[PDB]
Amino acid sequence: SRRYDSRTTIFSPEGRLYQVEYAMEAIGHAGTCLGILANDGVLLAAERRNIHKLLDEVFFSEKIYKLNEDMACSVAGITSDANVLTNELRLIAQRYLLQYQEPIPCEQLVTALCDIKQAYTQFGGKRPFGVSLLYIGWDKHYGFQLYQSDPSGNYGGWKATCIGNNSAAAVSMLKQDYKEGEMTLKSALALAIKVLNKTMDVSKLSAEKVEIATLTRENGKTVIRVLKQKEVEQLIKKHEEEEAKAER
C-alpha cells in the first residue's frame, strides 16, 4: 500500500509539484487554443483535433463549451478531464444563480474551479486534471473578460493569450500585434487567424481545422455564437488576401 502509492500531492526537493508540471506537458502537446479580448466582445479560436476522418459532426463544437448565459470556455489537454471540469463549472454557475438570483461574475466562477484544482494538488493522493482552460464572459462588474487557468489551480485575466501547441510563439505574435484599448471583434478575428496560420505547422490552414466562438452583447443580452464554416473560410480568404499588400 505505501509501496504502490505514487504520492501525487507531495513536494519535490526544489519545492515543485511534479504531477502539475507533467500535466502542463500534456497540455502543451494538445490543440492550440487562443483567446482575444476586444472593445465590443471576446473570442475563442481553437485548433480542432477531431479533424477530420470519417468523423460525423453531431455537436455544435468540439472544444467550445457554453457555461451559463454569459460565459463560455475552451480547453486544451485531456478531453475526458475537460468534460468533468466543464460540468463542474456549469454546476457552480447554477448554484450561484440559485442563491443570489443573478449570474456568477466571471472571475468568481474561475476562482471556484481553481480551488478544486488546487485541492487536487494538496491532498487526496490523486492525479490532477490535465487541462488548461480559456474563459470568456461578460458581467456587470467588469464587462468583457478573458481568463486562463491551469492544473496548478492558478488563473489570471488576459487581454489576449494562448494555450496548447506552440503557445509561446502564439503569445509573441499577440504581444506584437495587439492594440490595448483599440481592438474590435473584427480586428481580433483577423489577428486570431493570423496567429493560427503561423502556429499550425499542419501547413495549409483550413476551416475544417479550426473553431471560433464569439461572445458579444446585444439589446442587454449576451450572445454566444460558434461561427459557421462559411464565415471561417471567409476570414481565412481575407487573411490570405491581406498577406500582400506586404509584397511589391
Binding site: 519545492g15 487581454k159 503569445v171 504581444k175 495587439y178
Partner: peptide, 30 residues
Amino acid sequence: KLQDERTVRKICALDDNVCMAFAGLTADAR
C-alpha cells in the same frame, strides 16, 4: 503586457484593518 493587472495582485485585504502579502505558490496562498 497582455495581462490584466487587477487579476494577479499579491497583496490582499483580509479584513478592513488587516492585509497580507505572500510569496510562494499563488494557488496555495489563495
